[PDB]
């Protein structure tokens, strides 16, 4: 008999193989610590191997023989540089954001806070104010412009109807979600398992896109799950709880050795809580991009309701030309003159006339 | 006067079109500065005491001297108007 699934190294050093539901189930295979050291496998590894049914007194099948790991021939898994030893880089392969159904939104996103492979940015917005729908839009645009990249989206602490709608509108792309109905322990477990799985995939020099909903709700779920941490920070925050989200987010990077890891997460902001804004602050110094959406702009039904002024990236020249960089300088001058709601109204008038390539070059003429 | 006003009138149907074209060119020259000219290399206007007409003594004459060349094209709707007319006023 044969078994297949994702490695889930528990605290006792044994593993579980999940299905499409991606939590604890029963068709799991136990991989001995000897086997783990033999193939140098870490959790989240895509293991496929011959394993007879669980023997007498045995509740889960034991992986007698491994054949395919990381979709490939297993010597690579054992003989590969460790993730931490990979040489990082700045993002250099920007992702062209040219989608027809909503040209305005993705055009603005790219022209203002361009995104490349290995980007670590944050969409930062109050709740019920445009994070999820825009995440869906950019996910579809990525699925159209970069079919090569393994695109993965995680939804945390979210409404089940949104989950269903998106998974219907994901067009089969790997959509994993965690509704608010689920206990936060499940939330943390699934998020971490996705973390190591993506880590393994990048370890195979792969480009991994992760789109996370509710990074702030993620931090809150960690704080709930994190039982002590001792010192309680300003506003009731766990100090060391963030490190698991901090490890989770800082893992995103541009690696010089092939592949990439780009993660974009939804930040809830001006929610009136010191916890939320503070956590925004710690994760702000970790990310290379912030795209702010304002409550009142969304209130005026203007979409996208981007807070243009403070949104930006680092090392634009590493994704843009000096021509592009200087045109961006000039445009940001114009917009720093130009008031936010006013900015959106007149820019939506201005830019709709030409599509992302049409707009891109006709505007490099104009802007 | 100015270089060949008869040629100017011949190459437009009605004078008010000519006036609006020359003045919009002048406004473009002012906003972008005089770098966005299309007669730069050799033939530039010149003052007497110095070479002051290189930068900006009079933009209207600059525009008219520009238009005598074939480097200027004007039309009722040659470009999506909304984009230009809503980027013009905020810089």
């Amino acid at each position: 008999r044969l078994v297949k699934g994702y490695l889930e190294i528990s605290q006792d050093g044994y593993g579980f193989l999940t299905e499409n539901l991606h939590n604890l189930e029963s068709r799991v295979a136990i991989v001995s610590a000897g086997l783990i050291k033999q193939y140098a496998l870490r959790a989240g590894d895509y293991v496929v191997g011959q394993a007879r049914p669980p023997r007498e007194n045995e509740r889960y099948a034991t992986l007698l023989k491994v054949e395919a790991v990381n979709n490939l021939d297993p010597e690579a898994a054992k003989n590969r540089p460790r993730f931490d030893e990979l040489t990082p880089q700045f993002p250099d392969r920007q992702i062209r954001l040219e989608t027809t159904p909503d040209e305005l939104s993705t055009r603005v996103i790219d022209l203002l806070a361009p995104i490349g492979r290995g980007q670590r940015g944050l969409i930062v917005a109050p709740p019920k104010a445009g994070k999820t729908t825009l995440l869906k839009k950019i996910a579809n645009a990525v699925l159209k412009n970069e079919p090569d990249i393994k695109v993965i989206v995680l939804l945390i602490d979210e409404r089940p109807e949104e989950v269903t709608d998106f998974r219907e509108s994901v067009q089969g792309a790997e959509v994993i979600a965690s509704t608010f109905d689920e206990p936060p322990q499940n939330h943390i477990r699934v998020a971490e398992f996705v973390h190591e799985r993506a880590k393994r995939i990048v370890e195979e020099g792969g480009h991994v896109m992760i789109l996370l909903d509710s990074i702030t709700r993620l931090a809150r779920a960690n704080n709930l799950v994190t039982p002590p941490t001792g010192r309680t920070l300003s506003g009731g925050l766990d100090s060391a709880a963030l490190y698991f989200p901090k490890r989770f987010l800082g893992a995103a990077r541009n690696i010089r050795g092939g592949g990439s890891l780009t993660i974009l997460a939804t930040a809830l902001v001006e929610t009136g809580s010191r916890m939320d804004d503070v956590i925004f602050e710690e994760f702000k110094g970790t990310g290379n991009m912030e795209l702010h959406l304002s409550r009142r702009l969304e209130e005026r039904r203007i979409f996208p309701a981007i807070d243009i002024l403070k949104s930006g990236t680092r090392r634009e020249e590493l994704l843009l030309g000096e021509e592009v960089t200087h045109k961006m300088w000039l445009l940001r001058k114009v917009l720093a003159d130009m008031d936010p709601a006013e900015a959106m109204e007149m820019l939506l008038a201005r830019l709709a006339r030409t599509k992302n390539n049409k707009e891109f070059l006709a505007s490099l003429a104009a802007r | 006067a100015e270089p060949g006003i008869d040629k100017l009138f011949g190459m437009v149907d009605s004078k008010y079109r000519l006036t609006v074209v020359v003045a919009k060119r002048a406004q473009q020259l002012l906003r972008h500065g005089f770098k966005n000219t299309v007669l730069e290399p050799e033939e530039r206007p010149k003052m007497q005491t110095l070479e002051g007409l290189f930068d900006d003594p009079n933009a209207v004459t600059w525009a008219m001297k520009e238009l005598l060349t074939g480097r200027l094209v004007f039309g009722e709707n040659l470009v999506p108007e909304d984009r230009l007319q809503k980027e013009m006023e905020r810089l």
């Binding site: 030409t354 599509k355 390539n357 049409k358 070059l361 006709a362 003429a365 | 009605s14 008010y16 079109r17 609006v20 074209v21 919009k24 060119r25 473009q28 966005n36 299309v38 520009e66 074939g70 480097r71 200027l72 094209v73 004007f74 039309g75 009722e76 709707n77 040659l78 470009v79 108007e81 230009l84 007319q85």
Partner: peptide, 29 residues
Amino acid sequence: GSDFVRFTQVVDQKTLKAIEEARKEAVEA
């Protein structure tokens, strides 16, 4: 102020060629 001449877009030949190049590449492929 007459609408027939009230607004008349003005652009130089080089930016005209840039915008028209954007037009011909606007028809992709």
